[PDB]
Amino acid sequence: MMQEPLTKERLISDWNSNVSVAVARTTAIAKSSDASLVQFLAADAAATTKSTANVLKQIEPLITQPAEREILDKIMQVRKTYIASRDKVSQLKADGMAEEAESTLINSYVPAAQGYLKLLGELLNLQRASLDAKAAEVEQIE
Amino acid sequence: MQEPLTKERLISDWNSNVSVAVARTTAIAKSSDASLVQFLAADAAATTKSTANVLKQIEPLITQPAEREILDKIMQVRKTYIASRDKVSQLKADGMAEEAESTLINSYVPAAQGYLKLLGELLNLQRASLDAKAAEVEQIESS
């Protein structure tokens, strides 16, 4: 019972950490004049990506509420926009197109990452609220 | 239940901050751009302040021998981690790219790995306590 929202809270926390890491890395890539940084960080980026893939596969079978499914649907859509803009920033920086990379970071990547993190926060708060309610019942009702 | 849950959430935020800082410092050390240090200074300071606030909240809640022992070890290694992080940033800002990369590999990465390993152990202490309590609840409700 309780372990359901507990497990989902932990998985979503890992996911949120992965996105925060990826945002810091993409920000550093976009602000560095070094066109080679993308390739230097490719292995780290791949580890972050695969970590999130693992989280997603674990979260999917645990989704039990319509609200969770709607939020997750929105997350996956926003995530598509985020991935496209992240990849565009990396491509432009690798090609030395610093100005266009900045335009993309500001107009596309930042809003997508912010929406991504906001929706992850909503799903996380959903789990935390369910778990907090059950924990309060267990403590008080005893 | 609320005690280990609060600690688990605070430690999760802490761990996220450390992972972000490690990614940022790695990017700084691998970039040929000496200016990245200054460009990311505000973000790095915000990560630092976030962890400081987490520590202020978690310290009074860490009361039992095992968690206190792990926390003491974390703070010890964290001293080395901070020193090496600051060294990496300083060498990069000073144009000592080669020395900054060497410091990243020989000093910063080992400290960061020990820091993250001990944070993971503290987090797992909280998670194991919560798992045990939740399982006890499921047992009671099953009878």
Residue numbers in the entry:
A (entry chain B): 57 to 198
B (entry chain A): 58 to 200
How is this structure described in the published paper?
Previously, we reported that a transmembrane chemoreceptor MCP2201 in a gammaproteobacterium Comamonas testosteroni CNB-1 recognizes several tricarboxylic acid (TCA) cycle intermediates and mediates a positive chemotactic response towards these compounds. We also identified a binding site for an attractant citrate in the MCP2201 LBD, which, similarly to Tar-LBD and Tsr-LBD, adopts a four-helix bundle fold. Here, we identified malate as a repellent recognized by the MCP2201 chemoreceptor in a bacterium Comamonas testosteroni and showed that it binds to the same site as an attractant citrate. We found that malate and citrate affect the oligomerization state of the ligand-binding domain in opposing way.
Here, we determined the three-dimensional structure of MCP2201-LBD in complex with the repellent malate at 1.8 Å resolution and found a malate-bound MCP2201-LBD dimer in the asymmetric unit, similar to that observed in ligand-free MCP2201-LBD. Malate was bound at an internal pocket surrounded by all 4 helices, which overlaps with the citrate-binding pocket. Specifically, residue R135 interacts with 1′-carboxyl group of malate via hydrogen bonds along with the potential interaction between negative and positive charges. Residue T108 forms a hydrogen bond with the 2′-hydroxyl group of malate. Residues T105, Y138, and R142 form hydrogen bonds with the 4′-carboxyl group. The significant difference between malate- and citrate-binding pockets was that the ligand’s carboxyl group (coordinated by residues Y138 and R142 in both cases) forms a hydrogen bond with T105 in case of malate, but in case of citrate, this residue is not involved in ligand binding, but instead 2 other residues, R81 and T104, form hydrogen bonds with the ligand. In contrast, the malate-bound MCP2201-LBDs primarily formed dimers (apparent molecular mass of 34 kDa). Residues S69, N72, and S73 were involved in a water-mediated hydrogen bond network at the malate-bound dimer interface, but not in the ligand-free dimer interface. The free energies of malate-bound (−14.5 kcal/mol) and ligand-free (−10.8 kcal/mol) dimer formation calculated by PISA support a more stable malate-bound dimer than the ligand-free one. We propose that the malate binding induces the displacement of helices α1, modifies the dimeric interface, increases the dimer formation, and then alters the orientation of the helix α4 C-terminus (via the dimeric interface interaction between helix α1 in one subunit and α4 in the other subunit).
